[PDB]
Amino acid sequence: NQSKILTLQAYDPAKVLVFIGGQRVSGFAADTKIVITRNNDNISVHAGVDGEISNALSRDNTGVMTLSLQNTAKWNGYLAQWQRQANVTGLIYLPVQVEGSQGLSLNTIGWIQKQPDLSYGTEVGQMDWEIGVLDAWLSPDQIQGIAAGITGLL
Amino acid sequence: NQSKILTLQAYDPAKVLVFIGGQRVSGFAADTKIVITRNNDNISVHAGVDGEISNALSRDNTGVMTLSLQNTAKWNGYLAQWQRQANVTGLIYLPVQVEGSQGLSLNTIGWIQKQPDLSYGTEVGQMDWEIGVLDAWLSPDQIQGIAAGITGLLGL
Amino acid sequence: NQSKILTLQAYDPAKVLVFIGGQRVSGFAADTKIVITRNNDNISVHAGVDGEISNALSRDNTGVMTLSLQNTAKWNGYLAQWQRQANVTGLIYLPVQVEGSQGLSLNTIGWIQKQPDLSYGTEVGQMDWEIGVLDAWLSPDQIQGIAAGITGLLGL
Amino acid sequence: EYQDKVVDVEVSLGTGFETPMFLAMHGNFPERIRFYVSTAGMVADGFAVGSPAYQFATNAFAGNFAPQRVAIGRMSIDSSKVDFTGTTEQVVVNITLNKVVKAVKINVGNTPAQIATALADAVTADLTGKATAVATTYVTVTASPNVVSVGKGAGVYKIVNESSETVATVLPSVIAENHNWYFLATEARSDADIVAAAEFAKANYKLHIYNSTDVDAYAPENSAASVFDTLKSLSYDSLGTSDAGADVDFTEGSVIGAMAANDPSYGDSLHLKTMPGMVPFAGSDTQRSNAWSRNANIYRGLYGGGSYIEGKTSSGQYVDVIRFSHWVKFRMEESVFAYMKRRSDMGLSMKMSDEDLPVLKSVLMNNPINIGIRNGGILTGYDTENKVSYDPTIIIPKRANIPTNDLAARILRDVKVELVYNNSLHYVKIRASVVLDRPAGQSTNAQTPMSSSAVGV
Amino acid sequence: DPTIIIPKRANIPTNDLAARILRDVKVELVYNNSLHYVKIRASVVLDRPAGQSTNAQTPMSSSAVGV
Amino acid sequence: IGAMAANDPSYGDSLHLKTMPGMVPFAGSDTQRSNAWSRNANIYRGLYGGGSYIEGKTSSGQYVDVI
């Protein structure tokens, strides 16, 4: 057996575009760029004493997306102004779309949940805005292939 | 014996349908949608003076149904308007149906018992409506293979 | 079905307005501003001797409203002075209005029921005023599309 | 389509499975196999009420396990014979040209010969000018290209169809045609015909059911003169049972009505099941023993009801075991075949390599095995006498063991499976005891009972 | 589920770049039908509700014989 | 042809058990099936409710997927 390359195109971080409200976000920090996590398990299991087991499907898809940005990016001021405006008026929902390079994607409606701490030191710091999303289901739209029907001997 | 899966498809909370008056109800909250309970036991026992036991079936079958909703749902306004109208005129009885998923179901006539208490706080609150129902006997209905099983039980 | 946002604008605690006598009240504390509750249920049920159920509407609609305030607010002094004046003369009834945000509201006439208990400790304390209200039926008011929904319910 | 009524409400008042196949002698249609869903469908096709096919169909649908669909075989009819032997109003139902129900009637010394000739005379112009009847105790009836059917209506007489076409050659014809049937039944109750059908049934993996009115069934245990002896001596498997009404209404349907919907995966026996349509066996105690040694099952009534007994086959093997084996075979090749087809439809057909062969363990454990464990048909666990486990095992060859010839031919073999069957309960014995004065006392030895003797030499 | 496809810059013909036109954007939807006509099949019993077989086994979904 | 046009040979897949939408199952007994096989005359045969093409042997005896 010979080793096989998975994808014919390399994973380029610059192709992972982030769109909030219709504008592209620029000025990301080092190390990680986007972190997407859910809040609860998808399926819960009720184990029985005798051995019978039953499962339930979760109806909650709330998630938290973390955006890391440098202190010198204008998007920090953008987010602060949006936070103030949403506070005074009341409308807090804006669209959020993330396009992956060679991975899964995401497209739902999000809001600003937590503001990050602001540190000042010898080096340029990092601030992690926490954005919450209505649904956190990742979508395999970019990949081509329909084998879900083929798979499954249930 | 080894382990076994009780059913084939998983229980889904969204598949449980609640109908009041003829419209589906949306706006449930927290981790408990509905709670159905009775008011009295089915049989009351009495001791004798020489060991005999006498059992008496109950003829009252009313119960309660607690509906948990967010205070941002329009069904709160619907119920409030219905309560005011019922107080003004007198009609209080409306149909109630609950179609459970992989579980027992209900179909009877209900009424509004007690209005919940609002609580404006930091987070979004929860209001619990007590809906009283005439008959509270749960029906197997969707579950199959019950008619055959019922005739299988022995007793004397 | 998938997930859905119940409303368009978020519930804001500061948008809830409380009026007593004709002045807005400021100085709320902790994580609970007001709590509105009733004293009795709307309908009481009685069992019969042969399965009949008889329901009787209640004709009492008084309730309680707990107001939570810091002990550094001037409205404490306002309420104390009002209580003393009411005891001396006899006038105890004043209007009370609560305008909820994305929720039910209230508009009735209230009175001061019980004076809270002070507690001077290390931290800043909390005083809870019980305000009794004549009518405690919550009104949909701001919520739109309620008149059409009310006529939609079926029943017999 | 146009619907005048927005809401329509029609009121009425008073209101898969293994399909069997019954090989009758008739000519009501040109085909050799037809499927019916109710007796009402058979009458429309010109089947006389009380005819062999009609009686079989109604018995089958009346059981607790009715198949809900039956197949009828076709054999050419050259003559039909109505025998009035035995003392006996005697209505005979006839249908001619598939357009008339000629229910001729007779009323009646009282010997068969009187009624035998009397009916033949009544047949003349009783219209009826398209068929003939000739007397002789019994009357011979023959059609011309006219569909003629005769069925019992009353009395003691019986119907004996006749045909020159031999069963041994017809069966290949009906299997070359639609083959979606499991139970095999026939009305050619001659000794040769039964044996021929039994031989064919085991070659094509069908199940052969038949009834016999022969008195030799329960003849003394040393006498071998019945069909049951011949089938037993050849080690065939067939569920033969002895009944008296078999030759009048063909009660084969009643037996099938209690098995068509019975799933083999439960290991459920045929013992003690009810047979709506049969009659209790009237033999004495010794006769029952004689039939038992013959492997000729009987339908015996106990405590007011009726119950089948022991379901044993000709070779001595229990029927449920025979049914279980067929179910394992049929539903094991199907699951493997289905999985292979799905792969080929995607273009990724299976290939004989170590990276894909192991998948067959998941396929076999899915459809045939796990279904047989939930229902209790297949035993599992550990045995402390044999000190051997009962878990199913599966072994799959690796690419290094496949002979080069099979690679050219693309055949995989030597796949091995292991199962354990779970037995039902048939007979129970009790040992009661009634005390009169005092319950038997016991020794005051409160020590733990030792399990072995110290001396071992 | 609705789907949307958008061309990439490598597939736009050079002529459309001069004219500044984007095309071949594709969308997909499914429409939900209302209800118009309903039919009922009522039945009135007179003596006894129709009895059922005591076969308490799970109903098999297919026939074993498939040839 | 409809079951081969888009099937690139590089996967080594064959015509065994593939579904032909429009052909009718072969009916000739079972011995007739044996005669055709020795003839290198493939047949469309129905099993377990569906239709399945059995073996794509060419006139010379070599399997089609090899050719």
3-state secondary structure chain A: CCCCCCCCCCCCHHHCEEEECCEECCCECCCCCEEEEECCCCEEEEECCCCEEEEEECCCCCEEEEEEEECCCHHHHHHHHHHHHHHHCCCCCEEEEEECCCCCEEEEEEEEEECCCCCCCCCCCEEEEEEEECCCCCECCCCCCCCCCCCCCC
Beta strand pairing call for D70-75 and D21-25? parallel
CB atoms within 10 A of CB E62: 12
Please tell me the distance from the alpha carbon of residue B129 to that of residue B114, in angstroms, as a whole number. 7
Give every CB contact of residue A141 below 8 A, 6+ residues apart in sequence: A105, E3
Mark out chain E residues that contact chain D at CB-CB < 8 A.
36-47, 50, 53-55, 57-58, 60-67
Q: How many helices (H) and strands (E) does chain B have?
A: 2, 11
C103/B contact by beta carbon, under 8 A = yes
**Neighbour tally for D45: CB within 10 Å:** 16
Bridge partners of residue A129, in order along the sequence: A67
Is B79 within 8 Å of B132 (Cβ atoms)? no
- CA distances to C72, D22, D255 from C123, rounded to whole Å, are 12, 95, 88
Q: Which of D345, D346, D366 sits opposite A153 (nearest CB)?
A: D366
Closest C-alpha to C39, from C135, C107, C141, C122: C135
Q: Is there a contact between D77 and D149 (Cβ–Cβ < 8 Å)?
A: no
Smallest Cβ–Cβ distance between F13 and the set D175, D338, D347 belongs to D347
Let me know: does F3 contact D346? Beta carbons within 8 Å: no
∠ CA F65-F66-F67, rounded to 5°:
90
Cα angle for residues B133, B139, B145 (degrees, 5° grid): 175
Inter-residue contact C69 to C140 (CB < 8 Å): no
**3-state secondary structure at position C106:** strand
- Cβ neighbours of D262 in E, within 8 Å: 55, 57
- Residue A152: list chain D partners with CB under 8 A: none
Alpha helices in D62-216 (DSSP H): 112-123, 167-176, 191-203
Among candidate residues D306, D293, D271, D285, the one with its CA nearest the CA of residue D217: D293
In the block, tokens 């439809």 appear at: D345
Token pair of D167 as six digits: 């069963």
Interface test with E, best of F30, F48, F52, F54 (most E CBs within 10 A): F48
**Do D35 and D73 touch, CB atoms closer than 8 A?**
no
Rounded to an integer, what distance in angstroms lies between the CA atom of residue B136 and that of residue B60?
10
Ranges assigned E (strand) in D230-347? 239-242, 299-302, 305-308
Method of determination is: cryo-EM
| CB contact (8 A) between residue E42 and residue D11 | yes
The reply to whether residue D339 touches residue A153, judged by beta carbons under 8 angstroms, is: yes
A63-70 and A126-133 as β-strands: parallel, antiparallel, unpaired? antiparallel
Tokens 């969308």 correspond to what residue?
E27
| F with D: touching (≥3 Cβ pairs within 8 Å) | yes
Exposure of F51 in the CB half-sphere (CA atoms within 13 A): 11
Q: How far apart are CA A108 and CA A89, in angstroms?
A: 22
Query: Does A51 lie at the interface with B, CB-CB under 8 angstroms?
Result: yes
Angle (deg, nearest 10), helices D167-176 and D191-203: 30
Tokens read off for F39: 């003839």
In sequence order, the 6+-apart residues with CB closer than 8 A to the CB of D376 are: D266, D267, D422
Interface A:C, Cβ pairs < 8 A: 19
- Please report residues of B whose CB lies closer than 8 A to that of C42: 83, 112-115
**How many D-F residue pairs are in contact by the CB < 8 A criterion?**
35
Angle subtended at Cα B42 by Cα B36 and Cα B44, rounded to the nearest 5 degrees: 140
Question: CB–CB of D366/D334 below 8 Å?
Answer: no
Tokens of A22: 């219709």
Q: How far apart are CA B14 and CA E63, in angstroms?
A: 35
Separation between Cα atoms, residue B60 and residue C134, nearest integer Å: 35
Kindly list the partner chains of chain D, i.e. chains with 3 or more CB atom pairs below 8 Å. Answer: A, B, E, F
CB D130 within 8 A of CB D137: no
Nearest CA-CA distance, residue A92 and chain B, Å: 16
Cα–Cα distances (Å) from D77 to A153, B96, D46, in that order, read 51, 66, 15
Closest chain F residue by Cα to residue E64: F48
In chain D, which residues have their Cβ closer than 8 Å to the Cβ of E60?
Answer: 16-17, 261, 263
**CA-to-CA distance for D283 and D218, rounded, in angstroms?**
9
Strand duo D183-186 + D207-212: pairing: parallel
Q: Which chains touch F (3 or more CB pairs under 8 A)?
A: D, E
Q: Of C146, C36, C8, nearest to C100 (Cα)?
A: C36
Torsion angles phi and psi, residue D185, rounded to 5? -140, 155
Contact check, Cβ <8 Å, A93/C12: no
Question: Quick one: how far is CA F44 from the chain centroid?
Answer: 6
Q: Under 8 Å CB-to-CB from B33, ≥6 apart: which residues? A: B13, B16, B18, B67, B68
In the Cβ-directed half-sphere of D229, how many Cα atoms lie within 13 Å?
14
